[PDB]
Design an enzyme around this catalytic site. Structure first.
Site: not given
Ligand SMILES: [Ca+2]
Ligand SMILES: [Ca+2]
Ligand SMILES: [Ca+2]
Ligand SMILES: [Ca+2]
Length: 223
Positions: A40, A84, A175, A177-178
């Site tokens: 994502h 994901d 923020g 994410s990943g």
């Molecule tokens: Ca974000």
């Protein structure tokens, strides 16, 4: 990261920031030329920033390297966030040092109750909005699959796990994410999704990296 602490500069040397004019996602350096992040987080024009602490100040240990290719998992479903995960190849190899270092992939999945380190530059408030400049860290345990699926009925697949605190107060957030979830020196999770941040009975949901090690190793070897 909500309810965490300042990691300390370059204490998480595999943490990267993905930048497209601004920080928008985390990632994890897995070798000299490859980063793993969340599907994502996909976009074109990514610059990988390694060696970062304050993402708004040049402090002298950064390496900025453009991505040459991104590979979203073949089965990524953006509606459900199943699978994901995404690989990013660097145009040039990162120089590995004390502050820029790769994180090992799992050889095994991790068990519930295992303590992990989650990190990122995301929002630190659970109702409002405040973005840190320096990297934040959170120690959190893997939760039972059973409590994960009860928190998010109908939405947890075998490719996801939950980590954090059912009472709330400590969690990943927008923020983050990943970015990485590291347990026993292995990258077991990727910050994926959740319902708000640090809310009671709504722990963070993470991509279960151990399911993807074969795909990671095969894809890197062929690209
Ligand atoms: Ca974000
Ligand atoms: Ca490798
Ligand atoms: Ca910096
Ligand atoms: Ca579906």
């Amino acid at each position: 990261i909500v309810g965490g602490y300042t990691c300390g500069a370059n204490t998480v040397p595999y943490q990267v920031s993905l930048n497209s004019g601004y920080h928008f996602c985390g990632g994890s350096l897995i070798n000299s030329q490859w980063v793993v992040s969340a599907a994502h987080c996909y976009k074109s024009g990514i610059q990988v920033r390694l060696g970062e602490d304050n993402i708004n100040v040049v402090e002298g240990n950064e390496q900025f390297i453009s991505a040459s290719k991104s590979i979203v998992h073949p089965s990524y479903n953006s509606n459900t966030l199943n699978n994901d995960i995404m690989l990013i190849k660097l145009k040039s190899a990162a120089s590995l040092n004390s502050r820029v270092a790769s994180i090992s992939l799992p050889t095994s999945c991790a068990s519930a109750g295992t303590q992990c380190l989650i990190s990122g530059w995301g929002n630190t408030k659970s109702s409002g909005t405040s973005y840190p400049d320096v990297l934040k860290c959170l120690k959190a345990p893997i939760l039972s699959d059973s409590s994960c699926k009860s928190a998010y009925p109908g939405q947890i697949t075998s490719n996801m796990f939950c980590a954090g605190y059912l009472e709330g107060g400590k969690d990943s957030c927008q923020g983050d994410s990943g970015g990485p979830v590291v347990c026993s020196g292995k990258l077991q999770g990727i910050v994926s999704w959740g319902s708000g941040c640090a809310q009671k009975n709504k722990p963070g949901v993470y991509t279960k990296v151990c399911n993807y090690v074969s795909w990671i190793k095969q894809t890197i070897a062929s690209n």
